[PDB]
Paper text:
Here, we report an arthropod-conserved insect chitinase belonging to group III from the pest Ostrinia furnacalis (OfChtIII), which contains two GH18 domains that act without synergism according to enzymatic assays and structural investigations. OfChtIII contains 987 amino-acid residues and is composed of four domains: a predicted TM domain (residues 7–29), two catalytic domains, GH18A (residues 94–461) and GH18B (residues 530–889), and a CBM14 domain (residues 922–976). The two GH18 domains of OfChtIII possess similar structures and substrate specificities, which differentiate them from the chitinolytic chitinase OfChtI-CAD. The degradation activity of GH18A and GH18B (or GH18B-CBM14) in combination towards EGC was equal to the activity calculated from the sum of the individual activities, suggesting that there was no synergistic effect between them.
GH18B crystallized in space group P41212 and its structure was determined by molecular replacement using the structure of human AMCase as a template. To study the substrate-binding mode, the structures of two complexes of GH18B were crystallized and obtained: that of wild-type GH18B complexed with (GlcNAc)3 and that of the GH18B-E647L mutant with a bound (GlcNAc)5. These structures were resolved to resolutions of between 2.2 and 2.8 Å, and all data-collection and structure-refinement statistics are summarized in Table 3. Secondly, the structures of GH18A and GH18B are very similar, with an r.m.s.d. of 0.88 Å for 344 Cα atoms. Although the overall structures of GH18A and GH18B are similar to that of OfChtI-CAD, with r.m.s.d.s of 1.3 Å (for 367 Cα atoms) and 1.5 Å (for 360 Cα atoms), respectively, there are obvious differences between the two enzymes. Firstly, GH18A and GH18B from OfChtIII do not have the same surface hydrophobic planes as found in the GH18 domain of OfChtI (characterized by Phe159, Phe194, Trp241 and Tyr290). Secondly, both GH18 domains have shorter and shallower substrate-binding clefts than OfChtI-CAD. As calculated by the CASTp software with default parameters, the volumes of the substrate-binding clefts of OfChtI-CAD, GH18A and GH18B were estimated to be 1628, 1399 and 1100 Å3, respectively.
Residue numbers in the entry: 528 to 902
Amino acid sequence: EPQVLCYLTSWSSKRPSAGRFMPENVDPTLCTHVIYAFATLKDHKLTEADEKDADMYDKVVALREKNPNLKILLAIGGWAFGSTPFKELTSNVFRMNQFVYEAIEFLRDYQFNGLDVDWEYPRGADDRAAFVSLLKELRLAFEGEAKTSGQPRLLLTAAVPASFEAIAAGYDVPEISKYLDFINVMTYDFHGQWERQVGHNSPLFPLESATSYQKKLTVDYSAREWVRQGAPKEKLMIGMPTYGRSFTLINDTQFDIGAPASGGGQAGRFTNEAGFMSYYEICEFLREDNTTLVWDNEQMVPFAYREDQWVGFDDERSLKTKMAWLKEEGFGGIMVWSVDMDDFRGSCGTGKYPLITAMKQELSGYKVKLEYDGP
């Protein structure tokens, strides 16, 4: 029973031509859960972010009609949303409780299977306690509802950071682990266009020559840090990105990890953000002339460069390798960011959804079992 939780970004519907992604585009057999991001808070209540969203919620749910075991969740928060609304949400019990009772009604009305909470990020003791009370109250009310109610309990999940420093600052790990059904660790964005050296978005292992700090910026170390802090392995869903992060090189002849960079790489035609590329945009980049693909055998991920453009990403081989690591460590499953950025049209020349397919096939047969795993 390894789980596969796939994020669906609302704004993917706004991309041009082939990029355009709609709930209909979702293969309902790929993922065990689809998490729709993001709803918002208005007057401290769970509400639809845009008036056009309600029809989208309807479309995402009802994927179910095509796979009745598929769970559909709604996410609130995200990076843009910030910390202040969550702080104000949890500032008093009545607001908090009323948010809780209405969220349940909101969710039951749309027939969602549960709520994903993405506070980015709690920081400091007051936030730490507030995040715990919020999760504690959602969880208990979800249960209480299932009993005073008819059906199966609403699911509760949260996206959490990979940075070991963010973990200490924001997360009472053992406490949140009691209330969450799934802990979705964001094991990506380790490097990017905010830095002035080239580095990979989501390296599995570090370079042997890495500084003790750079060694921590990896999928492997992050996931292990979550375990070390008390997260139950069966609830830990390790984040898998279907995008890459790109750089403009200072010097075309310097293209190795650590090479000087002036900023992000040229935007992809569909995601329109320098420094960022969806997987189908990567494939386009790779078929340009003279683009050299490299396999980093220490980090265990690919990257590619052509003239002053450099991109670090995940492909079939790196994701499969990650699944092998995953099973060996014994984690409960994966989280995918995001389903709309995998090559859902099969324009890379392999199949449709080649990234998620590759992970799914490599996960076939895996059963998660807890056992003593040393310190």
